[PDB]
């Protein structure tokens, strides 16, 4: 007598006509050195790739995402959209344009009448080939991710923290610290993000 | 490409590392939390009625082990039994236990263990049941009750005569 | 405990089993380790505790029979390997099938052995002070054991 539940109903989720990813025009230091302030919200879709570091996404990566994602998605049941602008930052030996991305940004978003488990594999595969570290996160997973971060700070049993020592100049520490370190609070070093750092 | 940090900064990072709170006792080693009130899925309640219905409707309930015979061969047995207006019933044992625990039939619990099939009808064509049983030699009979009387296979054979 | 006897006719006879010491110090413990307050207080040296979960020929008993939790089943399994490799279980040696004798090669004394000596390769480039290659001692599974030292145990030697 195996128990069962009603299948999750995605009937509310309508399907955009242009479900497939659009094309991206190849031709239209701090950009990747801090926490992002854009694209951090899911919006329409429920599944997206989360940038866990700072990196530049040039046109080559755009095509790889485009081609891979487009092929497997079902037009009847799935759709996707882009959450970052097209390449605009000049690069010279004006060889090409690279789109900057900050840690925490959602590179691409997916949605439709599909479960996360269905979209887990391809998004993880696509993420792996992105220049910076990335991950596939559903709406719940990103929420859980933030909740664990806040939970860690509250229940931390270490009296000393980077913020308090840095702000109060305890130990004369600011001799060895950058002005930006006070804002970051030790979470971010260069273009790298340290999740375990509270 | 990581750039080496000043040693003083590295000392600062080491001392400000997150420390988690540690419980004194593992939750697993501790007694398990009591189960909350369960929810009956719409499989046991409906099937419960079916078990109630079959007992109420059928005066004779005889039990035989499931033989794992091909369904293509179950059909002919069902068709053969249908021609004799004798029906077959199969139910999950675990939800059958509570009724058999508290019902007119309570000594049949050992019979209702494992894969099984139920012989149900309205007429005691018990002798013909052996003939239907004799049609397939390997299928055995475990026992049950006929005409509201609980008896074993050897007793059933004498009762059949 | 049931034993099979053959005669062909073969039958199994059930025998009475030695009983556990009654009244555990800590009732309500699921695992038999916690009903006696042994969670973090046994090591490979404790043959008396370890031997109880071992088959006569040195194999570990299945978890569903011992009743240990997974966390403690793995610790017992690892402690038993280290105990065997230390020569602390001379009477649980492997059975010799037929026409087989012990290797007769002299036995090296070892203890706290994480890996099987057969498959561990020599460290030919040991490294300098800060790139030193470490020789693992003990098991990571026992990292939570009670420590009576000022500093944590030195796993990497």
């Amino acid at each position: 007598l195996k128990t069962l539940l009603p299948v999750p109903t995605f009937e509310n989720v309508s399907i955009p006509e242009r479900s497939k990813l659009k094309f991206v025009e190849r031709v239209p230091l701090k950009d990747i050195r801090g926490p992002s302030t854009e694209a951090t919200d899911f919006t329409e879709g429920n599944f997206a790739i989360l940038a866990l570091g700072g990196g530049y996404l040039h046109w080559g990566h755009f095509e790889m995402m485009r081609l891979t994602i487009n092929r497997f998605m079902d037009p009847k049941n799935m759709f996707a959209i882009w959450r970052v602008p097209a390449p605009f930052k000049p690069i010279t030996r004006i060889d090409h344009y690279v789109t900057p991305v900050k840690t925490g940004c959602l590179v691409v978003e997916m949605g439709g009448r599909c479960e996360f488990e269905e979209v887990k594999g391809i998004l993880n595969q696509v993420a792996h080939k992105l220049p910076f570290p990335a991950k596939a996160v559903s709406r719940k997973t990103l929420e859980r991710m933030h909740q664990n971060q806040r939970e860690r700070e509250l229940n931390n049993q270490n009296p000393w923290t980077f913020e308090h020592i840095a702000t109060a100049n305890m130990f004369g520490i600011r001799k060895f610290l950058s002005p930006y370190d006070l804002t970051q609070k030790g979470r971010y070093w260069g273009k790298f993000y340290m999740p375990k750092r509270v | 490409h990581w750039r080496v940090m000043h040693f003083q900064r590295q000392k600062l990072m080491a001392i400000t590392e997150y420390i988690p709170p540690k419980p004194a006792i593992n939750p697993r080693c501790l007694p398990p939390p009591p189960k909350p009130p369960k929810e009956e899925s719409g499989l046991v309640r409906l099937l419960r009625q079916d078990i109630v219905a079959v007992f109420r409707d059928n005066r004779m309930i005889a039990v035989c082990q499931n033989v794992a015979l091909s369904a293509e061969d179950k059909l002919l047995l069902r068709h053969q039994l249908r021609k004799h207006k004798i029906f077959i019933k199969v139910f999950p044992s675990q939800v059958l236990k509570p009724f058999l625990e508290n019902s007119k039939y309570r000594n049949l619990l050992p019979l209702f263990v494992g894969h099984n099939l139920l012989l149900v009808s309205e007429e005691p064509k018990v002798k013909e049941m052996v003939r239907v049983l004799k049609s397939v030699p390997f299928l055995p009979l475990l026992g049950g009750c006929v005409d509201d009387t609980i008896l074993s296979r050897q007793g059933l054979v004498d009762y059949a005569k | 405990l049931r034993e099979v006897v053959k005669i062909t006719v073969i039958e199994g006879r059930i025998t009475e089993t030695p009983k556990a010491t009654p009244d555990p110090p800590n009732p309500s413990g699921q695992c038999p380790i916690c009903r006696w307050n042994l969670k973090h207080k046994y090591t490979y040296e404790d043959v008396l505790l370890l031997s109880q979960f071992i088959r006569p020929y040195g194999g570990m008993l299945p978890r569903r029979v011992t009743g240990l939790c997974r966390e403690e089943h793995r610790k017992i399994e690892e402690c038993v390997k280290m105990a065997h490799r230390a020569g602390l279980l001379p009477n649980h040696r492997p059975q010799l099938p037929e026409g087989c004798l012990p290797k007769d090669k002299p036995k090296l004394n070892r203890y706290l052995t994480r890996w099987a000596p057969k498959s561990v390769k020599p460290i030919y480039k040991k490294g300098h002070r800060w790139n030193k290659v470490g020789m693992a001692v003990g098991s990571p599974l026992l990292k939570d054991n009670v420590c009576y030292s000022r500093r944590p145990l030195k796993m990497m030697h």
Partner: peptide, 27 residues
């Protein structure tokens, strides 16, 4: 460079001394 055990404690001891210095300058 992993930070030594003794190095970590000596910094903490100094931090506590300065932490008290905060209290006595607040009145």
């Amino acid at each position: 460079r992993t930070v030594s055990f003794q190095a970590k404690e000596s910094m903490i001891r100094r931090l506590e001394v300065e932490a008290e210095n905060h209290y006595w300058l607040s009145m």
